[PDB]
């Protein structure tokens, strides 16, 4: 109880935050019908470092930052080899949200649906195109991209895994 | 549906984009003859007196069309010009009537969005 | 041995048929007669697929 949380908020230049949806989810009780706020926060620096997080609380801002503290303990790093794009195409479903990611030329800003585009514009990739096949959901969507960019391999570690010395690569 | 023989018979075909206006059946808007200019009520959640003209068309159909705007001149046996577009509140009204066109005057004293109601500029 | 299968199934159909026609209502052995007819029939299309003359001998034997 020292006060004002100035040093303790950690001013968040390192991780920039945004919501991607704040739906009010509600439960009914004996007394009636009371609601809490479920916010989904995607945290990440533009270095290649993102992760989702849900939260719910009766306040809006405590749900956002509570989802952020859930989010900033959930980070993967993005395998993004070239001039801020992707090594190869990928698809990976989670639940019932399927996400096709596809690398792009460098003259192409990120084009995807709002959750996928949110976790990629926070991922610092600049050149991708990801269609979403399946759900209208936002959480399983974004988390499906996170699973869809964990399982993604560069050329250096595939060259290391196969044992092949090196060729067949322009750069 | 295997690639072999349940599907080089046929899959099936979707029908069409089903016509959202069974009259007007050439193309977009069609001259009409007023038969009734009655007034009906919407479904249960709304409450209004919406004023529709049941109108015979030059195509061969007869159809009850909505009349937009506030004022209306439309008496018995006048000539209108109906267009498509579904008024949700009224069961059966599928069409609108263009205002400012032939024998259906523009609305009285409107100065916001006049091209939808056929009123020339003031000032 | 193939012609013992065709001939053996033929005696199978003879004895089962002279069972069934004087009996007339066993609806269980009807499947046995029809599996024997189909099984023998795929054998006859097999040996006809292989040969001419030899399958002509299988027809002329019975």
């Amino acid at each position: 109880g020292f006060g004002s949380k100035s040093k303790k908020e950690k001013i968040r230049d390192g991780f920039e935050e945004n919501v991607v949806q704040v739906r009010r989810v509600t439960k009914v009780v004996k007394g009636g019908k009371h609601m809490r706020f479920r916010a989904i926060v995607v945290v990440g620096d533009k270095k290649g470092q993102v992760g989702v997080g849900v939260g719910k609380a009766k306040e809006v801002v405590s749900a956002v930052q509570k989802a952020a503290v859930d989010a900033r303990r959930n980070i993967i790093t993005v395998p993004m080899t070239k001039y801020l794009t992707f090594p190869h195409r990928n698809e990976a479903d989670y639940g019932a949200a399927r996400v096709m990611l596809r690398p792009a030329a460098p003259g192409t800003g990120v084009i995807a649906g709002g959750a996928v585009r949110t976790v990629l514009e926070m991922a610092g990739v600049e050149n991708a195109l990801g269609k979403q096949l399946g759900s209208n959901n936002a959480l399983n969507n974004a988390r499906a991209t996170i699973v869809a960019v964990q399982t993604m391999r560069q050329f250096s570690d595939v060259a290391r895994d196969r044992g092949i010395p090196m060729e067949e690569l322009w750069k | 549906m295997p690639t072999i023989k349940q599907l080089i018979r046929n899959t099936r075909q979707p029908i069409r984009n089903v016509t959202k206006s069974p009259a007007l059946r050439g193309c977009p808007q069609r001259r009409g003859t007023c038969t009734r200019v009655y007034t009906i009520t919407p479904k249960k959640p709304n409450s209004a007196l919406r004023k529709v003209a049941r109108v015979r068309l030059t195509s061969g159909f007869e159809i009850t069309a909505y009349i937009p705007g506030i004022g209306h001149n439309l008496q018995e046996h006048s000539v209108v010009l109906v267009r498509g577009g579904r008024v949700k509140d009224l069961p059966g009204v599928r069409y609108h009537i263009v205002r400012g066109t032939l024998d259906a005057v523009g609305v009285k004293d409107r100065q916001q969005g006049r091209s939808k109601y056929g009123v020339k500029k003031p000032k | 041995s193939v012609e013992f299968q065709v001939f053996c199934f033929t005696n199978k159909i003879r004895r089962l048929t002279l069972h069934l026609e004087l009996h007339k209502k066993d609806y269980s052995s009807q499947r046995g007669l029809r599996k024997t007819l189909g099984k023998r029939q795929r054998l006859l299309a097999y040996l006809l697929k292989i040969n001419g003359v030899r399958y002509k001998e299988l027809i002329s034997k019975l």
Partner: protein, 134 residues
Amino acid sequence: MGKDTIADIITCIRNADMNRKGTVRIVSTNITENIVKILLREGFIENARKHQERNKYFLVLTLRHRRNKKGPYLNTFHLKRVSRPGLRIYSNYQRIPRILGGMGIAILSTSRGIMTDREARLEGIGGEILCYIW
């Protein structure tokens, strides 16, 4: 011994390592021998051994791993068929795909033998794409 002798080997690979078992026993026909010959030399697997059990020469095949992890092999193998029996696929030397840029290979049946994309892209020949792994 079903309908396919290549979904035989391939489905034994997927079903082998999705249960993390690093050992395959399959039949050794000519095209299976050729696939494991063009597959051990490309770093996916470790060793292929012929032997006999009732004078029937089989292939036991040792898959790759790494060390004691949550799962001892990191890169999931992801084998896939393409030219199904009943839907044959055929490619020129144009269509022949660079799988993921090259991180996968597309083993395919040339008039020479069966090659990879390296050994059929330099030849300029084309043929029936058996399957591509990645």
